[PDB]
């Protein structure tokens, strides 16, 4: 699905992602932009304002876990279904997350990379990442 | 439906776009064609290559339309009526494709105006672009 | 956005529902719970069994709300404001679920009023239920 | 996916479907209710009004073909992917049909069966058919 020169483009820009921060920024933005996703993180405390969500420590910490998982997918870009199987069970059987939301999180992640890299997130770089996030959303949907 | 704060947000972010609206509108189109190649089927008679002057002229038209949607954020069906007839009656654009262009536009703005693309603004821009999309996909009078 | 013909259609089909609105609203809920069991998660404290008096009372409330959306088809955000606060701010219903209830309602009306469920009416009812859905999923003021 | 008593319910009501007419009624309704789907049937002539669409002979005739295919799926409710493979290629590679539209056609078909069978299209019968049409939509999406 990804050409050798678009697998390489993806890895190069990913080696520059702050893994402590980007994951939180994405999960944060999901909860602000699509406010019904807050229903699934009811235990995380105060999610009452954009400021509250973005500074909530448990959002920051869960976003590290989610980004951890995308990085796992980026190491195994062939065998994404096998990478994400356990996580598909969890998001369905136990959480009941509608799969459209998986697509929304991938798109929000694309915007956060745009926002951090600026000019260097070129149209061809974006297109390689759109293939990557669609892959992860499909692997997760049960 | 937009909140009053949504409207202030969109009016102020799009105000900062200003005279790059044409250049951003072209870049958003070029992102959409590369990342979602099925959208090229609506533009069969265009040069769709990188730097095409026809894509750059189309991006100016799209941007100038968004500028007018913002100036008429309270009465959009009326301001966008001819556009609605073009996209819904004549071209019959599947609504899925409005979600693709909208995403490409957000991505373009994130890359160009990072200091303005706060979570609150991101949320208000996304709701505005969905309201524009709904007007353009609907056959109404 | 609804056309003027859409509005006449919905006003006249829903007028024919009349005093079965409560019974249809219960049946639509029961279809939704059987066919899409994840929607039961929003109703954890209800008896959801067949013939439950709590589902039949909830179907009357849903139906009576649709009757008022029809009477205020031109100013729905204002007429549906408290409902919008309940579903979007308090319950946080994922918008996917509004497409499920809407479909179940169309199916209920098709089964009960076949002579009224013409293609044109079907089209206008579907657009009305999507406009109601959009008001209820939006946090606005 | 379908219990033995919901496979049987599905077959019983399907043995009563007018295969010359229901397929057309469904395709007709798709073009009226979701008007952008008309873009894909531009060769079928006049689709200008609900009356025109519903009486168009080429809509009636294509709807027989589509219903033919659902009946093929209902005979092979295990191996739906293998039943619909050629048709998935055609709808993607050649037609470029977004897969959300496959879901819309299945739902319209459910409403047409509601409209024809009335009281006998009970909630449990509807739920078995919702499993059937989701199956067909998934098998078709590439
Ligand atoms: C799209 C890519 C996504 C990935 C890669 C991802 C990954 C993860 C991971 C790694 C966990 C932790 C599992 C564990 O620690 O055992 C998790 C848990 C969870 N995810 Fe996701 N997730 C994604 C999307 C979503 C979305 C869209 C939602 C909700 C809208 C969601 C809601 C949750 C919830 C509620 C949990 C449990 C959190 C908790 O422990 O309290 N996820 N996910
Ligand atoms: C915010 C979303 C959009 C806006 C503001 C927009 C605006 C416009 C404008 C201003 C025009 C030119 C009308 C004229 O020259 O009189 C136009 C034409 C067109 N649009 Fe859009 N558009 C949008 C979304 C889309 C999407 C998603 C598609 C397809 C994927 C699309 C396909 C076209 C096509 C094919 C034309 C005809 C261009 C030509 O043949 O010269 N538009 N649009
Ligand atoms: C047309 C669509 C809908 C309408 C007109 C509607 C209308 C209503 C009304 C009138 C109430 C009662 C409010 C009150 O008693 O003051 C209500 C409550 C509720 N609705 Fe909806 N509703 C719709 C869609 C949905 C959907 C799709 C869901 C979830 C799948 C949902 C879940 C609920 C819940 C959980 C309650 C709270 C009921 C309770 O705890 O007693 N509604 N709705
Ligand atoms: C969801 C179930 C569907 C099934 C079972 C189905 C089945 C078929 C079949 C059997 C054919 C004929 C193929 C042949 O004769 O070789 C066909 C062709 C076609 N289908 Fe579908 N289809 C479905 C959905 C759709 C949808 C949603 C669209 C468009 C919105 C669509 C557009 C077409 C078109 C354009 C053709 C070619 C028609 C022509 O020959 O001019 N189909 N489909």
Curated annotation (Swiss-Prot), chains A, D:
<dbReference type="GO" id="GO:0030492">
    <property type="term" value="F:hemoglobin binding"/>
</dbReference>
<keyword id="KW-0670">Pyruvate</keyword>
<dbReference type="GO" id="GO:0005833">
    <property type="term" value="C:hemoglobin complex"/>
</dbReference>
<feature type="modified residue" description="S-nitrosocysteine">
    <location>
        <position position="92"/>
    </location>
</feature>
<feature type="site" description="(Microbial infection) Cleavage; by N.americanus apr-2">
    <location>
        <begin position="118"/>
        <end position="119"/>
    </location>
</feature>
<dbReference type="GO" id="GO:0030185">
    <property type="term" value="P:nitric oxide transport"/>
</dbReference>
<dbReference type="GO" id="GO:0005615">
    <property type="term" value="C:extracellular space"/>
</dbReference>
<comment type="function">
    <text>Involved in oxygen transport from the lung to the various peripheral tissues.</text>
</comment>
<dbReference type="GO" id="GO:0006954">
    <property type="term" value="P:inflammatory response"/>
</dbReference>
<feature type="site" description="(Microbial infection) Cleavage; by N.americanus apr-2">
    <location>
        <begin position="83"/>
        <end position="84"/>
    </location>
</feature>
<keyword id="KW-1055">Congenital dyserythropoietic anemia</keyword>
<dbReference type="GO" id="GO:0071682">
    <property type="term" value="C:endocytic vesicle lumen"/>
</dbReference>
<feature type="site" description="(Microbial infection) Cleavage; by N.americanus apr-2">
    <location>
        <begin position="34"/>
        <end position="35"/>
    </location>
</feature>
<keyword id="KW-0007">Acetylation</keyword>
<dbReference type="GO" id="GO:0098869">
    <property type="term" value="P:cellular oxidant detoxification"/>
</dbReference>
<dbReference type="InterPro" id="IPR002337">
    <property type="entry name" value="Hemoglobin_b"/>
</dbReference>
<feature type="site" description="(Microbial infection) Cleavage; by N.americanus apr-2">
    <location>
        <begin position="73"/>
        <end position="74"/>
    </location>
</feature>
<feature type="site" description="(Microbial infection) Cleavage; by N.americanus apr-2">
    <location>
        <begin position="70"/>
        <end position="71"/>
    </location>
</feature>
<keyword id="KW-0479">Metal-binding</keyword>
<feature type="modified residue" description="N6-acetyllysine">
    <location>
        <position position="81"/>
    </location>
</feature>
<feature type="modified residue" description="Phosphothreonine">
    <location>
        <position position="11"/>
    </location>
</feature>
<dbReference type="GO" id="GO:0045429">
    <property type="term" value="P:positive regulation of nitric oxide biosynthetic process"/>
</dbReference>
From Swiss-Prot, chains B, C:
<feature type="modified residue" description="Phosphoserine">
    <location>
        <position position="138"/>
    </location>
</feature>
<feature type="site" description="(Microbial infection) Cleavage; by N.americanus apr-2">
    <location>
        <begin position="133"/>
        <end position="134"/>
    </location>
</feature>
<keyword id="KW-0007">Acetylation</keyword>
<feature type="glycosylation site" description="N-linked (Glc) (glycation) lysine; alternate">
    <location>
        <position position="7"/>
    </location>
</feature>
<dbReference type="GO" id="GO:0005576">
    <property type="term" value="C:extracellular region"/>
</dbReference>
<feature type="site" description="(Microbial infection) Cleavage; by N.americanus apr-2">
    <location>
        <begin position="13"/>
        <end position="14"/>
    </location>
</feature>
<keyword id="KW-0408">Iron</keyword>
<dbReference type="GO" id="GO:0042744">
    <property type="term" value="P:hydrogen peroxide catabolic process"/>
</dbReference>
<dbReference type="InterPro" id="IPR000971">
    <property type="entry name" value="Globin"/>
</dbReference>
<dbReference type="GO" id="GO:0098869">
    <property type="term" value="P:cellular oxidant detoxification"/>
</dbReference>
<keyword id="KW-0225">Disease variant</keyword>
<dbReference type="Pfam" id="PF00042">
    <property type="entry name" value="Globin"/>
</dbReference>
<feature type="modified residue" description="Phosphoserine">
    <location>
        <position position="49"/>
    </location>
</feature>
<feature type="modified residue" description="Phosphoserine">
    <location>
        <position position="35"/>
    </location>
</feature>
<dbReference type="InterPro" id="IPR009050">
    <property type="entry name" value="Globin-like_sf"/>
</dbReference>
<feature type="modified residue" description="Phosphoserine">
    <location>
        <position position="3"/>
    </location>
</feature>
<dbReference type="GO" id="GO:0005829">
    <property type="term" value="C:cytosol"/>
</dbReference>
<feature type="site" description="(Microbial infection) Cleavage; by N.americanus apr-2">
    <location>
        <begin position="121"/>
        <end position="122"/>
    </location>
</feature>
<feature type="site" description="(Microbial infection) Cleavage; by N.americanus apr-2">
    <location>
        <begin position="108"/>
        <end position="109"/>
    </location>
</feature>
<feature type="binding site">
    <location>
        <position position="58"/>
    </location>
    <ligand>
        <name>O2</name>
    </ligand>
</feature>
<feature type="binding site" description="proximal binding residue">
    <location>
        <position position="87"/>
    </location>
    <ligand>
        <name>heme b</name>
    </ligand>
</feature>
<dbReference type="GO" id="GO:0071682">
    <property type="term" value="C:endocytic vesicle lumen"/>
</dbReference>
């Amino acid at each position: 699905h990804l050409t050798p020169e678009e697998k390489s483009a993806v890895t190069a820009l990913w080696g520059k992602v702050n893994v402590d921060e980007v994951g939180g920024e994405a999960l944060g933005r999901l909860l602000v932009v699509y406010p019904w996703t807050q229903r699934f993180f009811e235990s995380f405390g105060d999610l009452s304002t954009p400021d509250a969500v973005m500074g909530n420590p448990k959002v920051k910490a869960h976003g590290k876990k989610v980004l951890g998982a995308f990085s796992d997918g980026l190491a195994h870009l062939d065998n994404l279904k096998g990478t994400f199987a356990t996580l598909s069970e969890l998001h369905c059987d136990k959480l009941h997350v509608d799969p459209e939301n998986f697509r929304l999180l991938g798109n929000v992640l694309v915007c956060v990379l745009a926002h951090h890299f600026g000019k260097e997130f070129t149209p061809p770089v974006q297109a390689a990442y759109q293939k990557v996030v669609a892959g992860v959303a499909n692997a997760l949907a049960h | 439906v937009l909140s009053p704060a949504d409207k202030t947000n969109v009016k102020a972010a799009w105000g900062k776009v200003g005279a790059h609206a044409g250049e951003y509108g072209a870049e958003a189109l070029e992102r959409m064609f590369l990342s979602f190649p099925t959208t090229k089927t609506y533009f069969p008679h265009f040069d769709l290559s990188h730097g095409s002057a026809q894509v750059k002229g189309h991006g100016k038209k799209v941007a100038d339309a968004l500028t007018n949607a913002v100036a008429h954020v309270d009465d959009m069906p009326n301001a966008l009526s001819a556009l609605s007839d073009l996209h819904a009656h004549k071209l019959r654009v599947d609504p899925v494709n409005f979600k693709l262009l909208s995403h490409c536009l957000l991505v373009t703005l994130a890359a160009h105006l990072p200091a303005e693309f706060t979570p609150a603004v991101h949320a208000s821009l996304d709701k505005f672009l969905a309201s524009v999309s709904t007007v353009l996909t609907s056959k109404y009078r």
